[PDB]
């Protein structure tokens, strides 16, 4: 079929990702409006409302039934390229699509780096405190 590292790229997989979504017809953020905005449902015990853009990897929760996933998406990560893409996936050029997947993989990397950075900082401050206590 279509390689399953690349599926986030098509709405159908994205909606499919919403196994249980609190919001539904009558509400502005349905799994369809969500996917259409590039969100994925990555639920957990502590937060099973958690959605994440498949492109820029921004995560967010505490959704409200009247939030519109698109403006909620511009007002949080404005630099998302996916937002700039106004054409259906199938009408994308292989070059365009490849450029896109590039930028994605990069954004993934930046996210993981930011993460490692914070983790390290925390550990840094722990160790420092300890050694200060010993003073």
């Amino acid at each position: 079929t279509l390689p399953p590292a690349w599926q986030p790229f098509l709405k159908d997989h994205r909606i499919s990702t919403f196994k249980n979504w609190p919001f539904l017809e009558g509400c502005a953020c349905t799994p369809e409006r969500m996917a259409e905005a590039g969100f994925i449902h990555c639920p957990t015990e502590n937060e099973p409302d958690l959605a994440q853009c498949f492109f820029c990897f921004y995560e967010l929760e505490g959704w409200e039934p009247d939030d519109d996933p698109i403006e909620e998406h511009k007002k949080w990560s404005s630099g998302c390229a996916f937002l700039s893409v106004k054409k259906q996936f199938e009408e994308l050029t292989l070059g365009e699509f490849l450029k896109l997947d590039r930028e994605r993989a990069k954004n993934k990397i930046a996210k993981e780096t930011n993460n490692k950075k914070k983790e390290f900082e925390e550990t840094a401050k722990k160790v420092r405190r300890a050694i200060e206590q010993l003073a």
């Binding site: 937060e47 958690l50 921004y58 995560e59 967010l60 929760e61 505490g62 959704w63 409200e64 939030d67 909620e72 949080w76």
Partner: peptide, 4 residues
């Protein structure tokens, strides 16, 4: 909505 709010950032994790």
């Amino acid at each position: 909505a709010r950032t994790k």
